[PDB]
Enzyme design. Structure first.
Site, PDB file in Angstrom:
ATOM      1  CG  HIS A  31      -0.524   0.424   2.466  1.00 19.55           C
ATOM      2  ND1 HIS A  31      -0.434  -0.404   3.562  1.00 19.55           N
ATOM      3  CD2 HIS A  31      -0.108   1.643   2.901  1.00 19.55           C
ATOM      4  CE1 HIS A  31       0.025   0.327   4.593  1.00 19.55           C
ATOM      5  NE2 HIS A  31       0.233   1.577   4.233  1.00 19.55           N
ATOM      6  CG  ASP A  38       0.145  -3.843   3.172  1.00 19.05           C
ATOM      7  OD1 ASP A  38       0.886  -3.434   2.251  1.00 19.05           O
ATOM      8  OD2 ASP A  38      -0.256  -3.100   4.098  1.00 19.05           O
ATOM      9  N   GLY A  88       2.772   6.387   7.974  1.00 18.23           N
ATOM     10  CA  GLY A  88       4.104   6.741   7.527  1.00 18.23           C
ATOM     11  C   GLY A  88       5.102   5.678   7.965  1.00 18.23           C
ATOM     12  CB  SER A 110       3.068   1.407   5.875  1.00 16.79           C
ATOM     13  OG  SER A 110       1.813   1.424   6.536  1.00 16.79           O
TER      14      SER A 110
HETATM   15  C1  LIG Z   1       0.666   2.771   5.019  1.00 12.53           C
HETATM   16  C2  LIG Z   1       1.212   2.683   6.449  1.00 12.53           C
HETATM   17  O1  LIG Z   1       2.154   3.675   6.840  1.00 12.53           O
HETATM   18  C3  LIG Z   1       0.125   2.861   7.469  1.00 12.53           C
HETATM   19  C4  LIG Z   1       0.686   2.483   8.852  1.00 12.53           C
HETATM   20  C5  LIG Z   1      -0.305   2.603   9.996  1.00 12.53           C
HETATM   21  C6  LIG Z   1       0.010   1.629  11.097  1.00 12.53           C
HETATM   22  N1  LIG Z   1      -1.002   1.620  12.157  1.00 12.53           N
HETATM   23  C7  LIG Z   1      -0.849   0.983  13.318  1.00 12.53           C
HETATM   24  N2  LIG Z   1      -1.749   1.118  14.275  1.00 12.53           N
HETATM   25  N3  LIG Z   1       0.259   0.290  13.569  1.00 12.53           N
HETATM   26  N4  LIG Z   1      -0.911   1.920   7.032  1.00 12.53           N
HETATM   27  C8  LIG Z   1      -2.155   2.310   6.767  1.00 12.53           C
HETATM   28  O2  LIG Z   1      -2.539   3.459   6.937  1.00 12.53           O
HETATM   29  C9  LIG Z   1      -3.146   1.255   6.312  1.00 12.53           C
HETATM   30  N5  LIG Z   1      -4.483   1.769   6.547  1.00 12.53           N
HETATM   31  C10 LIG Z   1      -4.920   1.967   7.792  1.00 12.53           C
HETATM   32  O3  LIG Z   1      -4.262   1.655   8.781  1.00 12.53           O
HETATM   33  C11 LIG Z   1      -6.329   2.544   7.978  1.00 12.53           C
HETATM   34  N6  LIG Z   1      -7.047   1.674   8.959  1.00 12.53           N
HETATM   35  C12 LIG Z   1      -6.211   3.967   8.539  1.00 12.53           C
HETATM   36  C13 LIG Z   1      -7.405   4.417   9.376  1.00 12.53           C
HETATM   37  C14 LIG Z   1      -7.021   5.341  10.535  1.00 12.53           C
HETATM   38  O4  LIG Z   1      -6.129   6.212  10.356  1.00 12.53           O
HETATM   39  O5  LIG Z   1      -7.623   5.193  11.627  1.00 12.53           O
END
Ligand SMILES: *C[C@@](*)(O)[C@H](CCCNC(N)=[NH2+])NC(=O)CNC(=O)[C@@H](N)CCC(=O)O
Length: 265
Positions: free
Chosen positions: A60, A109, A214, A216
């Protein structure tokens, strides 16, 4: 010599989180894109160096279908945006996004990045740049085992800023029984996913250690056999650092096959 690192003590701060030197996480990578024309370079995601010319990340992270020339990967940098003293920058020769990656459920992912250099040895190991050890497919660590995560991502879910310095978080492997939609706000959880979150609740700080936006593509490393072993790739999560809500990660052991192939061997 994968999984080794000269660990230095993290500086705690305001949010109760940790700031740390890149030496404590030599496998961490920062990926940037340049949509062409001109006008800046945007932070896209974090990444993990599995070997000298290869980097793992979250599928993603590649929303806007980029081209290898646009993507740049820097390693050995503590501060997200300042140039690191022993940093090493490369360019993507070619990147692979897992064919069955579900944008809807974040299943699969995972994505690879083959670096490009004039030598069959791109990244040059150093106290600031070093690969992580891949687990064997039989590796199943005990529930509640303590691991770590790193990244330059956001601090609070509702924040317009990414971290200015490398973050170090301390979490624990949640058991499978606790890694279901019922706990993740009815969100979908698959066999390719693995939950981990900070269990130290109540304390002063409203937020518990966790990865946010950020981060991910960043690592979730656990010590095993005296070497940091890669266990998951930061994939998704409902919110950030909410007490008792584990973060969801890509189960790397489910992808050793996929990697082995798409990676030249
Ligand atoms: C793409 C990547 O940097 C983010 C990392 C978020 C990690 N979150 C946790 N708790 N470790 N990945 C994403 O944003 C993938 N999509 C989501 O997580 C959505 N559920 C975002 C919804 C929200 O911000 O509450």
């Amino acid at each position: 010599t994968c999984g080794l690192r000269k660990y230095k003590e993290p500086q705690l701060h305001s949010t109760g989180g940790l700031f740390t030197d890149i030496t404590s996480h030599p496998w961490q990578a920062a990926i940037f894109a340049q949509n062409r024309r001109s006008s800046g370079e945007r932070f896209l995601c974090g990444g993990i160096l599995i070997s000298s010319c290869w980097v793992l990340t979250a599928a993603h992270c590649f929303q806007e279908s980029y081209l290898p020339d646009q993507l740049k990967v820097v390693l050995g940098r503590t501060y997200r945006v300042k140039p690191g003293e022993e940093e090493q920058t490369f360019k993507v020769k070619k990147y692979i996004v897992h064919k069955e990656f579900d944008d809807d459920t974040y299943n699969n992912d995972i994505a690879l990045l083959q670096l490009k250099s004039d030598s069959p040895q791109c990244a040059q190991e150093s106290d600031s740049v070093r690969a992580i050890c891949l687990p064997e497919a039989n590796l199943q660590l005990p529930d509640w085992t303590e691991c770590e995560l790193s990244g330059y991502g956001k601090h609070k879910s509702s924040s317009p800023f990414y971290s200015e310095q490398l973050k170090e978080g301390h979490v624990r492997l949640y058991p499978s029984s606790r890694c279901a939609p019922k706990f993740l706000f009815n969100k979908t959880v698959t066999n390719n996913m693995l939950c981990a979150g900070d269990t130290r609740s109540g304390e002063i700080y409203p937020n518990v250690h966790d990865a946010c936006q950020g981060d991910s593509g960043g690592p979730l490393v656990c010590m095993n056999d005296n070497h940091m072993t890669l266990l998951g790739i930061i994939s998704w999560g409902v919110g950030c650092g909410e007490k008792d809500v584990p973060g969801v990660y890509t189960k790397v052991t489910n992808y050793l096959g996929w990697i082995r192939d798409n990676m030249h061997l």
